[PDB]
Nucleic acid binder design. Structure first.
Lengths: 97, 89, 94, 102, 97, 102, 94, 89
DNA sequence: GTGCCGAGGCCGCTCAATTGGTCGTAGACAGCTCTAGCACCGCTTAAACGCACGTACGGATTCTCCCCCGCGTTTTAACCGCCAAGGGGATTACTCCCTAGTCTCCAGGCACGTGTCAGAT
DNA sequence: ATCTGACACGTGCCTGGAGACTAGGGAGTAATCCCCTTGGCGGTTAAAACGCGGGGGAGAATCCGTACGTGCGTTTAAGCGGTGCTAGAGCTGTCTACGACCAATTGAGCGGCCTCGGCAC
């Protein structure tokens, strides 16, 4: 969080961290809010990739597919109902930007 | 997957309301994970010296996951469905 | 005693009973699964997906739409306190 | 937000008070895909070289991340209002994370 | 918590509610703190008994044994390392008052 | 605490400051056994009439309740200290419960 | 090919391999359990309980006591940030 | 339970330190619950095609549950135990 | 009002689900034994409740500082379409490593009972 | 200094734990098809970063009522302990309801591909 961000590696843009706050309903945000928000996403992505890599490595593959992340997602006891299919991202979806 | 089961109930309950394909996949994913949490509850409450899941184990396992009003309305609906299966087999 | 079709039609259900039996047996949680337990789990899913579909259908009609979206599912679950206790740990729409 | 199809609520230097009302009406992710793919491959490159990431795996990785990030920021807003304050500070998010892992 | 206590049932004594705050390191306690404390202990015991009773019903017993509580503890995904054996109650044990 | 041969480590009446150090040194539970059995049978009477409770089950039931209650209050103390206050109130405990279940 | 000892003595482990295999096989997870998974699971338990016993013994020695108690085991856990994350959700006896 | 195995470890590390009987039961319950979490992690990480658990499944399961410095030292100890067992069969 | 792409409808194609038997097998039931949970009375006595005194503290108020929202400008990189090469995911077939199963043997850890010293007072 | 009763130690044993074929399945390897991933280029252009007044939120200082720490006594009930009773767990011994396995069959639900209408601007 406080020290999970490091110089030299790519991070979230500053404006997108403020968008994450507005989805939560916050009205006023401090100027030193980007550092904890960038830290938490970089921690959560590091947690998700590390679980997904070992599922891929144990299956002797080289590409992280949807089955590897799904085994990674519920290994942390986090139920996920937004499983993508081949029809994902149609008109307005949960996967678009 | 439970896609065709969910669509039939929507036709019975809301005849003028359809469902998106993306929304149907999320509902089916809820239905799959709902059966998984009940299945874990049925095994946990089952005694270690037993190797069969009876109908009574699923009854008590759903009562833990479903609190108060939902659990009370669940047990009446399960037993009515079971006794229909017992006399029509 | 008679058959007249599938198991779900025999128990007067719309969720497939034989599919819920595959959930119990291929889970690995137990060696043997009784036939009455498969029907009970089928009635478990059928009733509480009926509660979600009833609330999502009313939420979709209130917004002057005839198709249920993922937003109407999330609004229906959050507006019910008893339904939120079961699937509130799940991930909806990011 | 920048992809095709739909999912955008409002644009054009839209004000902050309107932003809370608009963001509760949209359903799309709010982190760019190219920056997230560069991020996702960079974490893997530190541990295992030459890892390909599926397009379906990228979408579901991003959905889990924002849903956990927004859930943390909603918990951070509660502590801010509990201290009779309206501005989310750095210490409120650190306290919110500490209350569940620590 | 707020309204989980009802008049007519035995509840946690007021001095025992204050001792719970002392073990948490609180130096000062409010006078209205006895109400959420009594609710939460009552809520957790209501949750623990309800899971344990249906574990007893399936095993066709009439006494709540230590195995029924243990299965109720692992059903909430809460690991418990305090297993009282026949040697419990010796000296400074964690199961004493 | 009142059980025979228990490590209570408290000597009669103590002040508030000395009670914190004394309770951090003891290991015994702080709810009496008789009133916990009375509560345990009373709630079980609402579901199944005439249910006996074993003494081994009562000890495991009380240990889970003590650890969950103290964990909530340690979380409730953090919200109090985050609001620049030194007095734990009823709102702080209800906020701590809401931040994990709700 | 060494018949002079047990599975734990062959792998030079103090944790019994046979009891660790019983936990793995009879967990209701999979039908087949290999021989190498039994030895590996016993070694993983053995190394990190050596970590707990090393910290508990140092905590007990610093308290001028020759017997490791429950409080010494508890006090060793939060003194290590890496060990506490594994068993932070566990009930450490009140 | 692992009462005798954990007592013999304490004699190897600290020869002049004993253990409470209640403390030994808690340490044994740590060993059972550590075995449950690793084994459940190994079942999860297996692909759907495979049905058995090899040594590589337990090795990667220990890396996920144990973070940073503990996870790296775990794989070194587990591999050295397997290779010693693989030469003294 | 109008573009538009997705749910609905329609065409095959399976293999999942179903019935019908045999086979063993696992839970229901009864009965005997006895560990243990409830109750209660005596008695103790540590402990909880209530009350008066007083001091620290959170709430209210005013004032001031500073930093963050709002708006304009500019740089810049995420994303369309559309392209292409190709790396590795499925898929199938062959080969063979090993592990559940069955039988046999045996000795090591666990309960029962007893000495004696680590620790609380 | 002085208990004490909990831990270390000695014994009986039987059920956990280990050894030796067996063979059948599942894991490993290799070739081949082609699906989906990386790279990128013209252009967009909406979003992101940057800069500049300006006001609202947070911090600091002061004051004070009232709610909580704290001795002191009174009051209530938790616990030893011992007792006795007996409701009900544990285990044994059928045996009959009932679930797994295997052979065969078919059509409900699967995918591929049009096509018009509901949601977005």
């Amino acid at each position: 969080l406080a020290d999970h961000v490091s110089v030299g590696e790519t991070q979230i843009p500053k404006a997108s961290t403020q968008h994450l706050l507005r989805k939560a309903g916050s009205l006023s945000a401090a100027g030193d809010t980007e550092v904890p928000i960038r830290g938490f996403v970089h921690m959560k992505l590091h947690k998700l990739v590390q679980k997904s890599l070992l599922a891929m490595q144990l299956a002797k593959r080289k590409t992280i597919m949807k089955s590897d992340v799904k085994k990674a997602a519920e290994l942390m006891h986090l139920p996920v109902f937004a499983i993508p299919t081949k029809d994902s991202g149609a008109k307005g979806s949960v996967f678009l930007s | 997957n439970f896609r065709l089961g969910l669509r039939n109930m929507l036709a019975q309950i809301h005849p003028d309301i359809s469902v998106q394909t993306e929304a149907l996949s999320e509902l089916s994913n809820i239905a799959v994970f709902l059966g998984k949490k009940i299945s874990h509850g049925a095994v946990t409450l089952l005694p270690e010296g037993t190797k069969t899941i009876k109908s009574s184990a699923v009854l008590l396992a759903a009562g833990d996951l479903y609190g108060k009003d939902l659990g009370r309305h669940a047990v009446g609906e399960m037993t009515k469905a079971v006794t229909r299966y017992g006399s029509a087999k | 005693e008679s058959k007249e079709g599938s198991r779900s039609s025999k128990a007067k259900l719309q969720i497939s009973v034989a599919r819920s039996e595959r959930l119990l047996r291929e889970h690995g949680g137990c060696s043997r699964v009784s036939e009455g337990a498969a029907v009970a789990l089928a009635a478990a899913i059928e009733y509480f997906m009926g509660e979600v579909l009833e609330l999502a259908g009313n939420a979709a009609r209130d917004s002057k739409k005839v198709r249920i979206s993922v937003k109407h599912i999330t609004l229906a679950i959050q507006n019910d306190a008893a339904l939120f206790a079961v699937v509130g740990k799940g991930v909806f729409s990011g | 937000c920048r992809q095709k199809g739909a999912g955008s609520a409002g644009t054009g230097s839209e004000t902050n008070s309107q932003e809370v009302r608009s963001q509760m009406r949209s359903t799309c992710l709010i982190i760019p895909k190219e920056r997230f793919r560069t991020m996702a491959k960079e974490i893997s490159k530190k541990e295992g070289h030459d890892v390909h990431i599926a397009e379906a795996a990228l979408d579901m990785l991003q959905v889990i991340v924002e849903s956990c990030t927004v859930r943390l920021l909603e918990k951070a807003l509660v502590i801010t209002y509990s201290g009779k304050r309206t501005r989310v500070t750095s210490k409120d998010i650190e306290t919110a994370f500490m209350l569940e892992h620590g």
